[PDB]
Amino acid sequence: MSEPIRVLVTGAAGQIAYSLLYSIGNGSVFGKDQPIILVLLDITPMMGVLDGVLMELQDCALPLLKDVIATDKEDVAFKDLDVAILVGSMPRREGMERKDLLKANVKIFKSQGAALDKYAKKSVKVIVVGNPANTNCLTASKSAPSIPKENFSCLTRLDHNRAKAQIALKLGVTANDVKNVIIWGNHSSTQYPDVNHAKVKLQGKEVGVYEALKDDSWLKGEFVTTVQQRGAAVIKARKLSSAMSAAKAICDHVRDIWFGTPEGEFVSMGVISDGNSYGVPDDLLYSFPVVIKNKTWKFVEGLPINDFSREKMDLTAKELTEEKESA
Amino acid sequence: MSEPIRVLVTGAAGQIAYSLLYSIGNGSVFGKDQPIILVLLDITPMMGVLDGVLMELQDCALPLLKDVIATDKEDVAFKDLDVAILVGSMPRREGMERKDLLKANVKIFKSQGAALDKYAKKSVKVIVVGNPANTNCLTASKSAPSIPKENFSCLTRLDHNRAKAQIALKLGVTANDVKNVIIWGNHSSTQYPDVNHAKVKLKEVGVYEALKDDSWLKGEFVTTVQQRGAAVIKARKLSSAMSAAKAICDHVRDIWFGTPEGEFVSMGVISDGNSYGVPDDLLYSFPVVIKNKTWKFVEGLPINDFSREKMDLTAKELTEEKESAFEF
Numbered sequence: 001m002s003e004p005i006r007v008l009v010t011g012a013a014g015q016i017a018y019s020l021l022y023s024i025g026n027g028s029v030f031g032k033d034q035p036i037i038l039v040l041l042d043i044t045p046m047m048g049v050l051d052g053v054l055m056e057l058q059d060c061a062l063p064l065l066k067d068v069i070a071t072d073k074e075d076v077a078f079k080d081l082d083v084a085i086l087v088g089s090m091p092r093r094e095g096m097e098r099k100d101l102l103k104a105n106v107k108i109f110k111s112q113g114a115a116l117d118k119y120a121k122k123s124v125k126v127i128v129v130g131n132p133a134n135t136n137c138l139t140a141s142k143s144a145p146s147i148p149k150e151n152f153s154c155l156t157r158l159d160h161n162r163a164k165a166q167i168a169l170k171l172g173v174t175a176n177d178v179k180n181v182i183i184w185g186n187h188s189s190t191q192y193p194d195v196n197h198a199k200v201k202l203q204g205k206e207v208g209v210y211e212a213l214k215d216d217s218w219l220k221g222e223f224v225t226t227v228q229q230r231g232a233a234v235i236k237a238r239k240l241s242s243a244m245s246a247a248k249a250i251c252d253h254v255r256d257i258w259f260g261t262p263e264g265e266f267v268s269m270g271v272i273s274d275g276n277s278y279g280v281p282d283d284l285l286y287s288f289p290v291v292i293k294n295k296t297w298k299f300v301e302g303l304p305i306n307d308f309s310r311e312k313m314d315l316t317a318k319e320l321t322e323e324k325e326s327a
Numbered sequence: 328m329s330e331p332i333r334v335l336v337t338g339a340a341g342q343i344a345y346s347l348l349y350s351i352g353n354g355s356v357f358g359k360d361q362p363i364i365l366v367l368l369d370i371t372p373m374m375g376v377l378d379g380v381l382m383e384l385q386d387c388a389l390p391l392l393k394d395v396i397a398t399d400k401e402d403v404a405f406k407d408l409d410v411a412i413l414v415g416s417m418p419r420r421e422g423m424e425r426k427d428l429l430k431a432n433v434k435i436f437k438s439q440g441a442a443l444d445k446y447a448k449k450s451v452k453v454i455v456v457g458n459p460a461n462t463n464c465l466t467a468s469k470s471a472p473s474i475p476k477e478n479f480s481c482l483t484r485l486d487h488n489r490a491k492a493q494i495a496l497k498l499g500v501t502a503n504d505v506k507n508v509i510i511w512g513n514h515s516s517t518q519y520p521d522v523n524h525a526k527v528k529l530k531e532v533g534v535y536e537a538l539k540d541d542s543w544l545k546g547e548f549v550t551t552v553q554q555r556g557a558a559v560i561k562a563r564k565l566s567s568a569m570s571a572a573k574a575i576c577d578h579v580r581d582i583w584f585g586t587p588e589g590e591f592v593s594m595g596v597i598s599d600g601n602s603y604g605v606p607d608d609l610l611y612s613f614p615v616v617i618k619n620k621t622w623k624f625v626e627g628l629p630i631n632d633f634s635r636e637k638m639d640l641t642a643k644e645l646t647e648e649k650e651s652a653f654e655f
Contacts, residue, residue, distance in 0.1 A: 018346075018568075018569060019345075019346065019349070021569070022346075022569055022572075022573060026573075028355075048562055049562065049563050049564065051562045052559050052560075052561075052562030052563030052564075053563065053569075055555070055558065055559045055562065056559060056563075056567060056569045056570040057569075057570075058489075058492045058496070059485065059488055059489045059492055059555065059559075059567075059570035059573075060488065060492075060569070060570050060573045061488045061491045061492045061495070061502035062502060063501045063502045063503035063504075066501075158386070161386055161387065161388040162386045164388045165385045165386055165387075165388050168388070169385065174390045174391075174393070175388035175389060175390050176390035230382070230386065233379075233382065234379050234382050234383060234386075235379075236379075237375055237376065237378045237379025237380075237382060238340075238375075238376040238379030238380060238383075239376065239379075240379075242383055242386070243345075243383075244345060244348070244349055244380075244383045244384075244387070245383040245384075245386040245387050248349060248386075248387040249387075
């Protein structure tokens with residue numbers, strides 16, 4: 001390629017980044033002909049771990065990895081970025097309530113937004129992973145007034161992929177046989193996994209998921225509940241939070257930005273809500289169904305919203321409005 | 328699509344496997360048109376973590392992953408296998424005498440060899456990763472008399488890839504531009520990282536001639552590669568799973584699809600009939616070319632005096648290991 005792109009991953013000594021870096025370095029995200037300068041940020045006490053991660057990346061003998069830089073300083077980390085994957089955040093520990101998790105992280109993302117605004121390229125694409133994702137993204141965006149608001153997205157693709165898998169498992173097909181599920185709203189308990197516009201190929205024929213299942217109460221109750229609580233279920237089994245599947249979801253999310261959404265499909269992404277036609281307040285970071293071409297996302301327009309869907313999309317909008325006011 | 332192949336990964340609840348399963352599931356090891364039935368084996372205490380691993384594999388929404396089976400039973404794990412990746416072994420607890428460790432691992436791999444011998448396809452490819460890789464692989468091979476000995480291999484590709492990375496680093500070139508490094512012999516400690524037959528494009532020139540620093544290549548390069556895994560563990564304090572999993576993928580891919588034209592790779596294989604003065608009936612890393620899923624020795628490579636000593640010393644380590652373990 002003409003030039004390597006500089007891709008920053010924060011929280012780079014942690015578990016999600018450990019499952020993500022190889023896929024970036026080996027060409028599976030940005031393309032088999034795209035060299036990459038990988039920039040890794042984490043806190044100062046983690047710099048020794050991060051030198052070990054540099055050693056492993058070296059020992060993968062990846063031809064596209066032109067350089068890997070480890071740092072604990074924002075000026076180094078955010079310099080001339082083409083992509084910023086914001087994984088680092090403060091975790092919710094025992095004893096702290098949801099308000100405290102929000103308070104802890106607002107300062108982190110206001111600072112990374114300021115660094116983006118001062119050091120990165122104005123064309124940088126910023127994908128926000130660390131929780132609370134949507135509000136962390138909004139905070140950073142507001143602190144980066146020189147970077148176009150459309151360049152900020154937050155990760156609902158993990159919830160999206162989980163919704164797909166539950167449908168595929170119930171109906172007995174592969175993941176690629178399901179498409180156009182939607183995660184509306186907050187990456188949180190109030191997310192709405194919507195399948196009113198989803199399709200599945202069943203006997204060579206594409207059918208709606210509602211029609212295919214003949215079980216509306218499952219789709220409107222237990223299905224929603226399973227996708228919302230999936231993260232806690234994984235934590236309960238392996239005593240750690242998801243890392244492999246979260247990294248795979250980041251790869252999907254960034255790849256669809258870089259290359260575009262597949263023909264006939266749209267995907268779930270947290271984006272700035274300004275101008276949406278679905279009754280969602282403006283100036284929220286909210287997950288919508290989008291299509292992507294030339295690295296520019298676009299709302300999927302004209303989807304019919306029934307009354308069950310209306311109630312769910314409004315409840316998640318309310319929670320996001322309340323998180324914003326806390327910040 | 329091809330019919331599904333059944334692929335086992337043992338130690339499936341551990342760190343290396345956690346970094347490996349995605350690459351198998353997403354098609355990058357066995358091909359984008361090859362559906363996979365992924366069989367995961369670990370010890371009963373790990374079954375709870377293993378079910379969370381299974382949940383994450385579902386949550387990747389992988390079209391090629393036809394099914395995922397998680398189990399602690401050999402008769403389930405080894406049925407009708409096309410590939411078995413034996414990652415799990417007994418790790419050495421602090422203050423464990425090596426007699427007890429050799430007995431624990433002989434027991435594991437005798438059992439798994441017997442399960443291969445009774446339940447798997449006779450065409451199964453077996454790749455041994457868990458330490459001590461070479462002797463564990465030999466144990467399983469001898470415990471599986473009906474499986475062709477050539478179907479067994481053990482992982483030296485991690486040290487092979489590390490060697491390639493150090494050469495490219497020292498010559499200021501990209502990883503794609505070095506080929507034909509060799510790891511001879513044992514998987515750890517005494518492994519001989521040999522670049523006497525390696526090429527680098529600057530166009531194509533021998534590495535010794537390109538670098539013009541015989542003592543670094545015979546000294547610091549060798550100890551850097553031999554000690555690289557201990558250096559990563561010191562820094563990360565945890566596994567070296569990301570690069571070990573990449574190496575496993577490279578190793579299995581090169582079995583499945585073959586080595587590129589003009590290139591060989593490093594693989595622990597049964598030493599029978601080699602022409603390099605290595606004892607027979609050893610599992611020993613050699614340079615190999617692979618076609619139609621069948622490896623063959625790269626023959627006739629000139630062995631200088633320095634290389635002969637390095638290859639004999641690692642042969643001696645393996646011989647002593649084999650005698651010690653087979654007392655069990």
